[PDB]
Design a protein around this ligand. Sequence first.
Ligand SMILES: [K+]
Ligand SMILES: [K+]
Ligand SMILES: [K+]
Ligand SMILES: [K+]
Ligand SMILES: [K+]
Ligand SMILES: [K+]
Ligand SMILES: [K+]
Ligand SMILES: [K+]
Ligand SMILES: [Mg+2]
Ligand SMILES: [Mg+2]
Ligand SMILES: [Mg+2]
Ligand SMILES: [Mg+2]
Ligand SMILES: [Mg+2]
Ligand SMILES: [Mg+2]
Ligand SMILES: [Mg+2]
Ligand SMILES: [Mg+2]
Ligand SMILES: [Mg+2]
Ligand SMILES: [Mg+2]
Ligand SMILES: [Mg+2]
Ligand SMILES: [Mg+2]
Ligand SMILES: [Mg+2]
Ligand SMILES: [Mg+2]
Ligand SMILES: [Mg+2]
Ligand SMILES: [Zn+2]
Lengths: 91, 102, 74, 211, 55, 141, 136, 43
Amino acid sequence: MIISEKNRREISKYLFQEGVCYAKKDYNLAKHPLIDVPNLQVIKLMQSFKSKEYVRETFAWMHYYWYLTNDGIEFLRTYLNLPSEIVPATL
Amino acid sequence: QIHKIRITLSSKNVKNLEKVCADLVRGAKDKRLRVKGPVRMPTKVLNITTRKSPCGEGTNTWDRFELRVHKRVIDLFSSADVVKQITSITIEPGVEVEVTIA
Amino acid sequence: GRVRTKTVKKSSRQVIERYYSKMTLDFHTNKKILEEVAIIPSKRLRNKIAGFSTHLMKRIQKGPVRGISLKLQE
Amino acid sequence: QISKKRKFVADGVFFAELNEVLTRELAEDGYSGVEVRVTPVRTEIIIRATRTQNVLGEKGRRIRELTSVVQKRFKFKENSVELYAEKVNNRGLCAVAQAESLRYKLLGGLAVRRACYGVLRFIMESGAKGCEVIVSGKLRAQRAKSMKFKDGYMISSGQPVKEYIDSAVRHILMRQGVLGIKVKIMLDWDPKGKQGPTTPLPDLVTIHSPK
Amino acid sequence: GHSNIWNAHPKNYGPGSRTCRVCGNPHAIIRKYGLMCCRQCFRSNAKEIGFIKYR
Amino acid sequence: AVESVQCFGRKKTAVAVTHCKRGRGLIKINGVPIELVQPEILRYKAFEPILLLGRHRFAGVDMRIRVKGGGHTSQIYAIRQSIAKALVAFYQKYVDEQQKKEIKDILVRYDRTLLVADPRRCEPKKFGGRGARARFQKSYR
Amino acid sequence: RTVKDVSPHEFVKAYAAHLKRSGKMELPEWTDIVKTGKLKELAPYDPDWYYIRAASMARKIYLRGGLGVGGFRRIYGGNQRNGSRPRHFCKSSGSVARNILQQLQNMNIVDFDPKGGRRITSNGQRDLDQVAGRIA
Amino acid sequence: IYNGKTFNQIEVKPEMISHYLAEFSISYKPVKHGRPGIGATHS
RNA sequence: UUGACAGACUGAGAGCUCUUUCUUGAUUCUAUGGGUGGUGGUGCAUGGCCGUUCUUAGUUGGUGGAGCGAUUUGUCUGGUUAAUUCCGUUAACGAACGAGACCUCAGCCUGCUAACUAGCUAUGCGGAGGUAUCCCUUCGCGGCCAGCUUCUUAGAGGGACUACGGCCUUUUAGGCCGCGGAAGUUUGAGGCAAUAACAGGUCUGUGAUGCCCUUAGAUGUUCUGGGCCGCACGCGCGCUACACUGAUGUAUUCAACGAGUUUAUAGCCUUGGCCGACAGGCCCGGGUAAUCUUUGAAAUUUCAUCGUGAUGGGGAUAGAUCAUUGCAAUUGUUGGUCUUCAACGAGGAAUUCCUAGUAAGCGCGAGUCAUCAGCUCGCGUUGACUACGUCCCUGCCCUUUGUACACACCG
Ligand SMILES: [K+]
Ligand SMILES: [K+]
Ligand SMILES: [K+]
Ligand SMILES: [K+]
Ligand SMILES: [K+]
Ligand SMILES: [K+]
Ligand SMILES: [K+]
Ligand SMILES: [K+]
Ligand SMILES: [Mg+2]
Ligand SMILES: [Mg+2]
Ligand SMILES: [Mg+2]
Ligand SMILES: [Mg+2]
Ligand SMILES: [Mg+2]
Ligand SMILES: [Mg+2]
Ligand SMILES: [Mg+2]
Ligand SMILES: [Mg+2]
Ligand SMILES: [Mg+2]
Ligand SMILES: [Mg+2]
Ligand SMILES: [Mg+2]
Ligand SMILES: [Mg+2]
Ligand SMILES: [Mg+2]
Ligand SMILES: [Mg+2]
Ligand SMILES: [Mg+2]
Ligand SMILES: [Zn+2]
């Protein structure tokens, strides 16, 4: 899916800073409740991350639940150019 | 430094609500405070009647689902600090306690 | 109809067997005795057992009753 | 500022949704159930499982992730909802745990009869008055059939069922279709109430021994 | 599709503006007390929600 | 010390309470004389407790009756029951027990409902029909 | 002797006659053309229906002192036939009630209750009581 | 005027003012009844 | 590789596409695998759920007894019960399910606890009437130091056990009648509800699901429009009637179960005031609720008109016109005003439900709901006739007996 660079940066930043993220299955929602990006782009970016094992996806009662993995943490650290010391708030 | 403190207790379990009301009343009495109540409001019976079948086949049978909400009112004539101390006692789950003035 | 089930009959028989000394021919005193000397989950069951025990005591006063073994009678 | 009716209904809906979310997330980890306790400016959620090591993870990373995602999804105030993992006492007396164990055994290729008999024996050796396990679906053939395993006491009618019977239902996704597993465990009277109902059966009369 | 066309039809009311919060189906929604669950999902989750059958 | 009693009559959902106290013998319902009670046809039921005991026995008590709930017939029945019970109680508590027993026997010999409430109530309706027992019309073809 | 001690029908007739004789009422021009409610099929049979309605409304206000226009619409409503569909309750005309209340207020029989609605004045109590007393 | 399948042709006349364009483009074909089929009677 | 001004194209301020050429920057495009979605097929591949067999009383081990065995006894001649409920008889003895017990609602408590979000009583003041001071009747307002809980609410308990009396019955289990009692059909009504089954329904409730189909010119998704409602006809559940035990117009006055807001000028229930014939509109406000809507129905009661005339019964059909909901009302959304005034005069063969606060009549609340109830789920008001028996019809349970049936007589 075509995603603006700023939107992808914001999504990745939020995911790494928090380590978890949810999303209601609403493709046409204007903005994600926690992220300024539209809901569809957040859902599809998380699906892309899950497809290559960067995140774990759980679905229940029309909602998504994404949890970052070690490979996902490494990818986000490399891509965001953050120092190795900084880690997701969950740890 | 005396005020009519209003305490409203709501719960789905009669036993826990009654025990909490009794504990609050005994705590207020132990401090020589004036207690009015507990006043039992009429029970609220939420009712939902839905068809048993997940489809349209068979005899139309219905499930009567009720959720009962019990509410109690207690009035104490004392200051805010003493009522706050009294309400600090342990409260079992399922009982909601709200404290207000008048 | 009003036919006492197996539970009521067995409870009345055992209670009379074990506490014949304190039994009376009055239903209310019998139900108080049952409350004292037995654990009955329901008040209705306690009342039924007390009534059948009173009936059994009335029968026993006349003479022997099959299924009840009283030490004094034997 | 909503009415009491809507408040209680929302509380029930939140409990149901949280239970479903935990069941979906903690399937393999084992999830007997959850309990929600509400306190002034603090809500406590306790997770019951047979394997709390998996639920917590290493240094509580998994439980922290669950707490964060629950707080974000349910709009809870930060540092206001916290999760706890507790051991389930007598897991053999929990219908959900036994159903999950049977699901795991069946998914591993174990024969249905052997797994069901083992579950029944484990339940009975755990102090259960009785138990019943039903397996339904396509077993050994394209024609669906039901398998019933039973031992001990069991009641099915009246009010005491709601307290003396613990039951669960689970689906197993096999290669050729879904398998339906039902676990029904009859508890035993417990004066303390920890391991069973604190009420005797309606038709149980006990006579104290005379002096 | 075009932003002004894709999903542009108003959905402020009617069965198409509401769905089951559990399964997302738009049919047989129980709106009483704010449950917003379809009758099947509600009948499945009634015990957890706190609804009891007395008669 | 005031000399008064308060007895209630019941019929379906109708509840009537009679306030009986020492007085000149007036009977009023909701501030209206008992002679104007509606419907006019049920005035006989309303007056039955008085027509059996005669007006003289009511000559020393003031009766004020408040009624609520139910319908037009149930309210009348509850009112008459309350009047009977209130008079019986007043005679029991402030008059010789012998006269109280006499009036109670006179009232009971005519109709037992004058002092004992009728326990009949509406039966809840069951799904599958419009009424408690009536079921929907069945068709086979 | 007060209104409570007389039959409502006889008192209504007497008070309607008294109100008509008073001459202080100003009947609207549409009294002879309007029905008393949407649920009615025909206009009132009695040419003096306005005075009778005013007397009944005054008696109601005398008994209870917090009634408004909607309350009187409910009081004088009833079943509405719908042809081949079942009947349901229907409210009565509100303009008639408002006009009658205003006219009664103009005569000092009722005034505005502080809590809302209308309340009987002392003059109204005296007038109704005298009318009831003269009925005998 | 589209009727769901085709654009029906009309010319606006003075007598049609204050009417909807739907009123002059019938969306259904008027029914002409053929002989009843199997299962019409014996119900 | 995206987006887009203008013109054309288009149902269309869809750059959808074309002409004209600007912007953007590896996020995509092309191809191969692999996915994803599908109210797509398969309920005769399935899970779960529900209905039915089946509202009846029925069902199964262990150890013993019988049989070569399938099987059988237990689980029964009899009496009794709503009951495989009991008493008993007994090659059976002990048990486990169903039934009962259980739990919810209703019916009694002048006995307990407690009520300014419920009331009563007396008092103080005030209005009205009566002899008008004092007295009597009726209304309105305050007393958190006036009293109290009969009336209302809801917690704990009590209460019925056929307890007692007369008969019948095996000195049993039990049954009929009767005083008393709130209650003597299991007090009434429900919820729950066994073993074994159906190729009964549901893949169109489910991010339940196997396999098959499709997967970009899509069976995915979205937008516009239409249809699901189309009308020679047949059938099912219903609403309105055929009238005077009535219709209409006045006057009159008695419920219960319930439901209600994002406060934004304001969203839900809406009081009060004003405007209007109605439908509706405007303005102050109350209620997240025993606090406000809620001071909360009709049938009915009461007095007049009508007068046996398809008539002032009936309200189908249709014309004109006015409002409200909605983005949109045409194929009338619904609701008002005037006008039109069809069949129908009690309904053939057939056929449904029902035994007491029941049937029937009467209305009310909720679900669906922006707007629409002749439907369903509940609620109350008025309130009956007949029977309290039987196996004739239609079926069900048990026993005996016949069978060439076992897909089980639709054999
Ligand atoms: K099935
Ligand atoms: K055997
Ligand atoms: K499928
Ligand atoms: K659905
Ligand atoms: K027969
Ligand atoms: K039988
Ligand atoms: K033969
Ligand atoms: K045979
Ligand atoms: Mg049982
Ligand atoms: Mg039962
Ligand atoms: Mg589709
Ligand atoms: Mg099937
Ligand atoms: Mg054997
Ligand atoms: Mg056998
Ligand atoms: Mg009381
Ligand atoms: Mg089939
Ligand atoms: Mg259709
Ligand atoms: Mg039907
Ligand atoms: Mg009323
Ligand atoms: Mg006519
Ligand atoms: Mg007519
Ligand atoms: Mg419609
Ligand atoms: Mg429908
Ligand atoms: Zn659902």
